[PDB]
């Protein structure tokens, strides 16, 4: 049942000091540590997506390279999670993040994946997301992280078999989508994956219409790509991350 | 013998450390719970035939053999390439569990090298099996007076089983030259005969219930490992603490600093370990080392006498003709309100002379 | 089946020491008193050399 029904077009915007995460589970007070990871580079370009399905294949996969910054200013509902692997296909194993309203599933099996896949609502069903799925390996079901104007960050990192996610929701009085200051990103799960992921794709959701067989849509997001980077966080009295400097942005930076 | 001499002159040698042995080890290692599934395998209302004998794989999860341990009528516990023993510390991958019911007479066949009916055409293991074999007696589960028909197993197969392969055609055996064309009789029989269990059948052939753990490990990081006991928590003691594999010997004092509910550990300025939260009750910790000391024998020379006095730099009095200086704590000293000039140097505007021996 | 080791011990030998003890051990909670029966087993084992 793969069918072809979203198009994006995409722009180019800049980071900001947006994407800060922590990098372990460590408390640190009153601090300055620098740390060496992937992190996603101050005021770098990122890509803004608009994936609109009215009511031909113009929805590629994106590759993931080192990780991968997420944000949409976007409900809950729309987004609905991820796919990771390398060829998508039966051949591979991959990995499917489906969120819902009541909880998140993240299961690594050998999914068929389709070209332009999509969570459709009727109940869910995965049957536009792939044809077939064996060979299973793994599943992890556990409270979700796109609850309930709010500004969402996640981080997907695929480190030496564990694939670490980190999430944040902020918010973003009115105004630019990408906001100034800093909310670091706290870490939500680390699974014990062990599979290649070179590639990646969101899931949207789209409705059935009922009465242009889905209702028509839109979902605008932001994708940046993290890079192994120096960073010098300050953590306040509180152990939060409250501001961070990129060592090698500018020469100033790199003096501090 | 520090200064590998038998005089000493008059003054002050650091001689020794002091240390405060560790009394206890405590072992908060984290909250143990989901369990692998074994009560759905082991304890099932209804097991599988052994041509079509059930495999479950078993992953993410607390392996335990304690339940095993405690189930009485077992009858073979064999285990290969690992001991039973150390089952629960040694951990693996991947744990397959394979159940199914055979004859007692054939148990002796679930082992590597071994021929028979059930390990050639109905379930074979490699020469190099890494796991154990259980089985038990279910007479009061699989047998009926009037027959239990429901148990199958393969008589007849062209050729052996590898390891780890299952058979559930349905395949008329061809054993002559004619073809069957699928109709029974001479020289073409159905493959799969069934176990007729009865109560009243000898110890041989009664039936006995059988699941095989096959233990693997691969390039994946293992992810099945048995659990680490958690000891009770002792506090404001020197205790050999190992908490979610983070291991030291410190006090636990009683902690002020809020973690957020991500973090585990913390560190100080200089990357060192200053607190900890217990992963059974969600509470901070002050990881405070130990004290320990300098030990320094202040002594006048040998030929005017052979008493001593010991000063423990940096530690308090209470932690060990005692009393407390800022240096640390002086034992075998009288202190004087009466000023002199300084003859052996203990530190803070104290000094030590021999008169007995005497700080002021 | 004439060389046997040892396959079960409470603790581990010292170098250049010889422990030729038949004594049972006990592998599990239950103890065995010194007779054989359920996971009660003999520490030295034979090699089936062919
Ligand atoms: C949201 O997703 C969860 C996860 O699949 C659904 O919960 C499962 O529902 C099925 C119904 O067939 C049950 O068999 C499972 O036991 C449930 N699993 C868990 C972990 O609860 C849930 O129904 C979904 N909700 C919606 C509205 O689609
Ligand atoms: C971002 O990339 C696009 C093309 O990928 C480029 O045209 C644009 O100049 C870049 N933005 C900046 C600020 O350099
Ligand atoms: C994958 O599935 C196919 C059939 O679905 C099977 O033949 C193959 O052995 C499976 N591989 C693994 C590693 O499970
Ligand atoms: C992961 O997949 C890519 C693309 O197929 C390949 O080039 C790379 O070598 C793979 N990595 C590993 C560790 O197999
Ligand atoms: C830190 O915590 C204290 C007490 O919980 C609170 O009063 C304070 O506002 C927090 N933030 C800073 C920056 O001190
Ligand atoms: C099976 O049931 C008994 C009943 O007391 C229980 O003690 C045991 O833990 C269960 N599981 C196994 C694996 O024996
Ligand atoms: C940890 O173990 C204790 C033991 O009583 C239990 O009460 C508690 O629910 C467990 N979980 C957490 C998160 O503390």
Redesign the pocket.
């Given at each position: 049942q793969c069918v072809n029904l979203i198009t994006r077009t995409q722009s180019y915007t800049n980071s900001f000091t947006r994407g800060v995460y922590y990098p372990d589970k460590v408390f640190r007070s009153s601090v300055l540590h620098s740390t060496q990871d992937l992190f996603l580079p101050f005021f770098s370009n990122v890509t803004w997506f608009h994936a609109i399905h009215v009511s031909r294949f113009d929805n590629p996969v994106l590759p993931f390279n080192d990780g991968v910054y997420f944000a949409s200013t976007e409900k809950s509902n729309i987004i609905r999670g991820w796919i990771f692997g390398t060829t998508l296909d039966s051949k591979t194993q991959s990995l499917l993040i489906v969120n819902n309203a009541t909880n998140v599933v993240i299961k690594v099996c050998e999914f068929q994946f389709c070209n332009d896949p999509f969570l459709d609502v009727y109940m869910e069903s995965e049957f536009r997301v792939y044809s077939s799925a064996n060979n299973c390996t793994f599943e992890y079901v556990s409270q979700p992280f796109l609850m309930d104007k709010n500004l969402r960050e996640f981080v997907f990192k695929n480190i030496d078999g564990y694939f670490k996610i980190y999430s944040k929701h902020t918010p973003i009085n009115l105004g630019r989508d990408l906001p100034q200051g800093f909310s670091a990103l706290e870490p939500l799960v680390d699974l014990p994956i062990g599979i290649n992921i070179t590639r990646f794709q969101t899931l949207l959701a789209l409705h059935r219409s009922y009465l242009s067989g889905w209702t028509a849509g839109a979902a605008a997001y932001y994708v940046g790509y993290l890079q192994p980077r120096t960073f010098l966080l300050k953590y306040n009295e509180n152990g939060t991350i409250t501001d961070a400097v990129d060592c090698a942005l500018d020469p100033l930076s790199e003096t501090k | 013998c520090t200064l590998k001499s038998f005089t000493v002159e008059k003054g002050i040698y650091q001689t020794s450390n002091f240390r405060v042995q560790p009394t206890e080890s405590i072992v908060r290692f984290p909250n143990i719970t989901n369990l692998c599934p074994?009560?759905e395998?082991?304890?099932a209302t209804r097991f599988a035939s052994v041509y079509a004998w059930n495999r479950k794989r078993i992953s993410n999860c607390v392996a335990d053999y304690?339940?095993?341990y405690?189930?009485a009528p077992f009858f073979a516990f064999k285990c290969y390439g690992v001991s039973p023993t150390k089952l629960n510390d040694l951990c693996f991958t991947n744990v397959y569990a394979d159940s199914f019911v055979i004859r007692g007479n054939e148990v002796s066949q679930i082992a590597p090298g071994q021929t028979g009916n059930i390990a050639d055409y109905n379930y074979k293991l490699p020469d190099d099996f890494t796991g154990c074999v259980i089985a038990w007696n279910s007479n009061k589960l699989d047998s009926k007076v009037g027959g239990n028909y429901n148990y199958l197993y393969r008589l007849f197969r062209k050729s052996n089983l590898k390891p780890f392969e299952r058979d559930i055609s349905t395949e008329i055996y061809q054993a002559g030259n004619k073809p069957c064309n699928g109709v029974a009789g001479f020289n073409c029989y159905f493959p799969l005969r069934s176990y007729g269990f009865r109560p009243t059948y000898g110890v041989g052939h009664q039936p006995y219930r059988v699941v095989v753990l096959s233990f693997e490990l691969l390039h994946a990081p293992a992810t099945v490992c048995g659990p680490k006991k958690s000891t009770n928590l002792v506090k404001n003691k020197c205790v050999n603490f190992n908490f979610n594999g983070l291991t030291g010997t410190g006090v636990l004092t009683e902690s002020n600093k809020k973690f957020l509910p991500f973090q585990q550990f913390g560190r100080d300025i200089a990357d060192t370990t200053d607190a900890v939260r217990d992963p059974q009750t969600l509470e901070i910790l002050d990881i405070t080392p130990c004290s320990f000391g300098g030990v320094s024998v202040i002594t006048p020379g040998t030929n005017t006498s052979n008493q001593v006095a010991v000063l423990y730099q940096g530690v308090n009095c209470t932690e060990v003709n005692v009393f407390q200086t800022r240096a640390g704590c002086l034992i075998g000293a009288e202190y004087v309100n009466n000023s002199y000039e300084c003859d052996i140097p203990i530190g803070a505007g104290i000094c030590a002379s021999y008169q007995s021996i005497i700080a002021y």
């Open positions: - | 074994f009560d395998v082991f304890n304690s339940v095993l405690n189930f």
